[PDB]
């Protein structure tokens, strides 16, 4: 299936990037930017001054400690995908 194969990749990538923090279950902000500047850099060719980063960090840290998790990890992908796309038409 599609989502099935995506899961295998997303799960591994999540742990891979979270390894930069020290462990392998959480990201420390910088890793989030690394993801955008490496995995989504082919789609979102903006960033630079850190625009989407300011927005994602407002929805990602749902716990309130700056700790990322699988729950917000996939939501992060949605956020960066929709935010940059809908950036052409706000309210």
């Amino acid at each position: 299936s599609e989502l099935e194969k995506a899961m295998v990749a997303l799960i591994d990538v999540f742990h891979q990037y979270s390894g930069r923090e020290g462990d392998k279950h959480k990201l420390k902000k910088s890793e989030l930017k690394e993801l955008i500047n490496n995995e989504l850099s082919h789609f979102l060719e903006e960033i630079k001054e850190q625009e989407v980063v300011d927005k994602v960090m407002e929805t990602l840290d749902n716990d309130g400690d700056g700790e990322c998790d699988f729950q917000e990890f996939m939501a992060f992908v949605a956020m960066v995908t929709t935010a940059c796309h809908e950036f052409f038409e706000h309210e």
């Binding site: 903006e46 001054e49 850190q50 625009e51 300011d54 927005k55 950036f87 052409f88 706000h90």
Partner: protein, 126 residues
């Protein structure tokens, strides 16, 4: 008629204050983000704050403020970028552009340039 200059850098609207200060806000409930674009020449427009009664002007130092009098520094070149956004360059300073910082404050014209995110504005209807 009124247009809100939505910057693709942080998602802030150009807000002109009646005191002469200019900044960026995300709240669409602010009546000072309603600007009127007056065309003087083909490709040259002047940004005037509706609920401010002041025109956007750039100083020779790079600062951006609102003047109560229409000066030669209140005219900006309206250009459409390839990304469907509007770029505004001063007619007085052909090397400086209008920009807003992701922090909410305005960006110095002397620190602008092509390729930045702060120089991308989108005139959204109000």
């Amino acid at each position: 008629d009124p247009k809100r200059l939505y910057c693709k850098n942080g998602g802030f609207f150009l807000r002109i204050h009646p005191d002469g200060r200019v900044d960026g806000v995300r709240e669409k409930s602010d009546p000072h983000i309603k600007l009127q674009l007056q065309a003087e020449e083909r490709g040259v427009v002047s940004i005037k704050g509706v609920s401010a009664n002041r025109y956007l002007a750039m100083k020779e130092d790079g600062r951006l403020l609102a003047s109560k009098s229409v000066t030669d520094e209140c005219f900006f070149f309206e250009r459409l970028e390839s990304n469907n956004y509007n770029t505004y360059r001063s007619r007085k300073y052909t090397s400086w552009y209008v920009a807003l910082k992701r922090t909410g404050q305005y960006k110095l014209g002397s620190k602008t340039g092509p390729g930045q995110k702060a120089i991308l504005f989108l005139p959204m209807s109000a």
